[PDB]
Amino acid sequence: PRGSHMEVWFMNDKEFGQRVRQLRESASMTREQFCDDELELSVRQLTRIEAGASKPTFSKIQYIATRLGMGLYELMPDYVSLPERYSKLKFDVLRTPTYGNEDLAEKRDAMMTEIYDDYYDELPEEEKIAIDAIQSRIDTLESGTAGFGKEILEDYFEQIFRKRKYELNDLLIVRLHLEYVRLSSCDSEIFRQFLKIIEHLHEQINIINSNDLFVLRDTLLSCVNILGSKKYYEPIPKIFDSVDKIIQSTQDFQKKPIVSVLKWKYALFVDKDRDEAEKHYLDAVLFAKLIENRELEQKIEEDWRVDNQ
């Protein structure tokens, strides 16, 4: 029962929003009643969907349908899942180890451009924000990212803090909240919140899908830099514990050198104990020798030299 088979007009963002409103209204529900606890779908998120300014993710359409008693395809007959080429590019981008490889970091940004050229403009909203979360930087505390103003992102952030189980896009979108922490004082609300996020991310390890663990790992590593920018070194060791325990379950091992460097830097610059630091330096070298990556080995050798001036 597709739109092409009934010969009807295709529902783009506006005219779909129009339908979602109709069905909600005629079922005597208001936005506040409809969204309920706002975990899956928020009131602000719904308003923009009805307005035609935001395209819903699969999980959101699913919820909108179930909440109206309808099937997914009864609501959106012409629904299609995310392009296979897009989902591949996203996956490759997120799984690229950058440190030590100049060549792979070049393929990474190449993929990102292909995403922006071909698929980004037609993704659902949550998916756009998650792609931006990969490498967008916020210059100003008042402003948002490109395309999206703060009030949107806040709504997504608040949604995630309440969630019991983070999806892959939640683990990405959180990374934008970190860019706001960078601009705020150590005394701020935003910072004390950011510490609660770290607490959440730890508990998420034994809750999220096994397959998503690699994104969580890298999100926890993003916190180390941020904690460093505020000289709040206390929770860094526990991050390392968790990152190592994730590396064990996943059997991924690509971040072993990155972690060992970060471990030496803590020992060297925070603890000022370069007997303990040199140990991790040697692990990273041994690793780079075993996988036979000269570039990585030379990078590790160089950084160690730089850090003893």
Numbering used by the authors: -4 to 304
Paper text:
The ComR-ComS receptor-signal pair is a regulator of competence for genetic transformation that is broadly conserved in a majority of Streptococcus species, including those pathogenic in humans and animals. ComR proteins are members of the RNPP (Rap/NprR/PrgX/PlcR) family of QS regulators, including Rgg, which are prevalent throughout the Lactobacillales order. ComR is predicted to contain an N-terminal helix-turn-helix (HTH) DNA binding domain (DBD) and a C-terminal tetratricopeptide repeat (TPR) domain, which contains the site of pheromone binding. Once activated, the ComR/XIP complex binds at the promoter regions of comS and sigX, thus producing a pheromone-dependent positive-feedback regulatory loop and activating the SigX regulon.
The native crystal structure of the apo-form of ComR S. suis reveals a dimerized α-helical protein in the asymmetric unit that resembles related Rgg-proteins. However, the construct used in this study behaves mostly as a monomer in solution when assayed by size-exclusion chromatography. The observed dimer interface between the TPR domains appears to help promote crystal-packing in this structure and the two monomers exhibit an identical conformation (RMSD = 0.192 Å2). The monomer is shown in Fig 4B, revealing that ComR S. suis is comprised of 16 α-helices divided into two domains. Helices 1–5 (residues 7–72) constitute the highly conserved DNA-binding-domain (DBD) and helices 6–16 (residues 79–304) comprise the tetratricopeptide repeat (TPR) domain that is the predicted site of interaction with XIP. As the active form of Rgg2 shows a domain swap of the DBD domains, the observed conformation of the ComR apo structure appears incompatible with DNA binding and would require reorientation of the DBD domains. This is reinforced by the observation that the DBD of ComR packs tightly against the TPR using α-helices 3 and 4 (DBD) and α-helices 8 and 9 (TPR) to form a significant interface region. All residues at the domain interface are conserved or homologous, polar, and create an extensive network of hydrogen bonds and salt-bridges that stabilize the observed conformation, showing that this is not a crystal-packing artifact. Indeed, relative to Rgg2 the DBD of S. suis appears to be held in an inactive conformation to occlude helices α3 and α4 from interacting with DNA and possibly inhibiting dimerization. Although the DBD is highly conserved, the TPRs diverge significantly so that only one side of the putative XIP binding-site pocket exhibits sequence conservation among the ComR species in this study. This creates a “conserved face” and “variable face” on opposing surfaces of the cavity for potential interaction with peptide pheromones. The homologous residues of the inner pocket are electropositive (R103, R170, and K250) which is likely required for optimal interaction with the C-terminal glutamic acid moiety of the ComR S. suis XIP.
